[PDB]
UniProtKB/Swiss-Prot annotation, chains A, B, C, D:
It holds the Pfam family GFP. This is GFP-like fluorescent chromoprotein FP506. Fluorescent proteins have become a useful and ubiquitous tool for making chimeric proteins, where they function as a fluorescent protein tag. Typically they tolerate N- and C-terminal fusion to a broad variety of proteins. They have been expressed in most known cell types and are used as a noninvasive fluorescent marker in living cells and organisms. They enable a wide range of applications where they have functioned as a cell lineage tracer, reporter of gene expression, or as a measure of protein-protein interactions. Keywords: Chromophore, Luminescence, Photoprotein.
Amino acid sequence: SKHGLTKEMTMKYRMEGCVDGHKFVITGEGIGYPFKGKQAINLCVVEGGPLPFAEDILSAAFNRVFTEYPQDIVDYFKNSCPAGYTWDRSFLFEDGAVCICNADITVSVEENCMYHESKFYGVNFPADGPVMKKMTDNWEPSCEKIIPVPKQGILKGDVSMYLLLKDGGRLRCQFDTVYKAKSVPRKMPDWHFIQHKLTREDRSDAKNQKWHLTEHAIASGSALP
Amino acid sequence: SKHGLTKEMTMKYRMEGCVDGHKFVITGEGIGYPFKGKQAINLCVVEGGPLPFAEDILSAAFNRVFTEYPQDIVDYFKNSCPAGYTWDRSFLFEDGAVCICNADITVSVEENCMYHESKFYGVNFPADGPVMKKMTDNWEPSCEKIIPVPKQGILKGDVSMYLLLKDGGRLRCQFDTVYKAKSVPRKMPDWHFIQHKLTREDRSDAKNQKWHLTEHAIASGSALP
Amino acid sequence: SKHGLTKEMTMKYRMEGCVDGHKFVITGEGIGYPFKGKQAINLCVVEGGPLPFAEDILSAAFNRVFTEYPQDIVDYFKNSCPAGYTWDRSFLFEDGAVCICNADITVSVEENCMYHESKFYGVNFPADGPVMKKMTDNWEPSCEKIIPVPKQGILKGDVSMYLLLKDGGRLRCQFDTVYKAKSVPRKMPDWHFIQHKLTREDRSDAKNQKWHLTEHAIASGSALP
Amino acid sequence: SKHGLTKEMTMKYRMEGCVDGHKFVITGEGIGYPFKGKQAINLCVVEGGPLPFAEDILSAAFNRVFTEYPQDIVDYFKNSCPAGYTWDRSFLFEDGAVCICNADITVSVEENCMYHESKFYGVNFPADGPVMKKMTDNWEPSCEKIIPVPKQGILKGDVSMYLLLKDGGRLRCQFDTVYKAKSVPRKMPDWHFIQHKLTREDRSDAKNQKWHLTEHAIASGSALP
């Protein structure tokens, strides 16, 4: 219980959102390894299912506690634990669609469990587009830049994301994030990168829309000396 | 009760939102003239006040039923009444801040009253910026383009907005809106303009954050023959 | 010769540019009415023809001297004559393509003729897109906002443009312009609108790519009192 | 003379451009190591000096031949040699300024020298801004994503850049590039990253504006297995 964290943790999730006027509630459970930056998550749509839009857009909404950090970069995210941190993100798609997501991350040390509460709002996805037609096929791996805001004790993230399409194409989406520990820390990182890789597999049956998500994420500094 | 509307109506409002992590609830009452495109509104912060951000950002969230339309353009908004219409908008500020707002408009014909329920979410306003420092001084009058989407029976709005600043400057914000009647109509307008003019005056006292808002709005076609 | 201008003038044009690596030179002649805001132009491709891209993208590059101004708004553009004015514009298309155009406008009072010299550079139009496939069908009429920059004696223009497509669709393009009289004037306008309407008709034959362009443009203040 | 390249090469440069209406010509000479991804360049302003804008904006305009590539990623850039390749880029600054740059790269095998011819156009830098006030202090190291366009035999680059400011701040700029070998190759890379690090030092004296630029660049695949 280095910051209330252990090598293998469980996670519980609850998301509320509204995309193109369609409301929904999703819940989930997962297992992850904070220090390896690995997590695996099972989501279940609990209101408003089946969703009229691609599962893939919600992927990056479901915890930088799961990142592998080298000893030589401050780990703003694990240091914020157990109380945790919150984040706000805008997604700007190349076709004018816009999302905002908000999440709150917290640890129960007694349960060795992370609680994740999020809100997802999306507007202006064209009904004819790959998201509303569910023609998407996961995000490509990426490199996000993490930038400290020193006067404020918060971080920014900047990653240009690509949602791959079933027809072989790709849809660009700009993520701009604000990461805020619940207690603004005296120790702050220098700017660094975090690389990410997602997998997503639908496991929906007759009763329920359900899928499986994984992330693998590793922080690092510039490769140039 | 042409569409359940009369020449002078009252309006009730309830807004829930969250800007840079700060939650709030606002309620309001107003009086307006649908056919003149004129409205006047009094807002009161009922949770989360005083607000940490400029009142001005919420202005365009508080009803295209209040627009003066010439006989020769279909009035998508009055035609949707009494049931009403919903809209979704993204605000993209020049400094990277992003909002989304959602509203639902409906008429009680028996009460001669419009009900307005909205949600406002904003992220990434810099703490040092004019919005979070409350250094803004109303929006400049504008011309919004309204564009029909014929296969779908909905409209888009496109207006480039300018929030004026107390120091003499201006902050650009791009509004992209989707307007959706609750029943998709057979009669749709051609593209047209709507011009808008807002006024805003804070009337906050010791007990309550409160302000007064007005809009005047007129639709028209191109000025070129 | 109010500013070296008369009610009906001729115009000569020369444009050099490069779009997606393809270089070209266009020359033209026209006739216009400065005080009515009306002009008609004939262009001829003189190097690099036939063009691999839609004629329509060059339309707004070919003179705010041709705008109808009411007496109650300063006419920054006619006041700059005969010496004239220069302008710089960025075009940002919704699909990531980007152009820049630069023009220089000047009067020969002796010839009652406006000289127009411009540069047009475009990058990143997808080869598969409506511009490079020549699938476009004129711009929709628009309303540009003109904004004074008082410390500097220059104007900005902001117009959200829509290039119509032969298949019934539309392509958004954001124009941001800087208008600079060659002598920064003591008399500056307040912000106002200019509305525009273009027509374009190809008149290409066997020897030469050629087309005809017209503009009609009228300035005005807000329609709200 | 693997593709006409050797381990250490000289480079000659000529740039023509225009930023906010100010024209200029720059020439340069350098020495670099193609296989190490290292180059060092000396620039001299030969017309239009001293420049009214920060040297730093021209930095990324002055050759992906200088990138360290692992054996397991196709090197589109060295493979295009000696004939070479061309590229087109848009720069979109957070404050609305816009640039376009075009370059042509070619090898003289007999002289063991790379020739670099470029064009740089910038508009809408505010006179009051850090670029026009020369208040900038180099770009931060970055990670660019290189994306193949398989039907066309060209690459795209996407990098979100940060120009550091003398006052401790930062200015965001989005680079979107198109890389085109003069002969479209049968061998194309998969998407990968290139990381970059620039240094810039002014060496201007009484006669001439002059500076020294270096780049170090290394390609790599995702760090996630």
